[PDB]
Amino acid sequence: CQPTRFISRHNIEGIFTFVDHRCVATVGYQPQELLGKNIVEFCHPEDQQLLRDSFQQVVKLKGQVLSVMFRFRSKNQEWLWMRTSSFTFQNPYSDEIEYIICTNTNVKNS
Partner 1 sequence: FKGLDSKTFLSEHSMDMKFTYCDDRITELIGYHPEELLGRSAYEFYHALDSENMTKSHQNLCTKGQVVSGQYRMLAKHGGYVWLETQGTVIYPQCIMCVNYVLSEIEK
Instruction: Establish if 85 lies at the interface with partner 1 (CB under 8 A).
Output: yes
Stretch that binds partner 1, among 15-23, 40-48, 50-58, 73-81 (CB under 8 A): 15-23
Site string for partner 1, 38-77 (x = CB under 8 A): -------------------------xxx------------
Minimum CB distance to partner 1 smaller for 17 or for 49 = 17
3-state class (DSSP) for residue 13: coil
Buried b (16+ CB within 10 A) or exposed e, 55-85: beebbeeeeeebebebbbbeeeeeebbbbbe
Distance set, CA 105 to CA 5, 61, 64, 76, 82 (Å): 4, 22, 18, 17, 5
Of the residues 32, 76, 94, 109, which one makes contact with partner 1 according to CB under 8 A: 94
Q: Of the two residues 78 and 97, which places its CB atom closer to partner 1 in the complex? A: 97
96 near partner 1, rule: CB under 8 A: yes
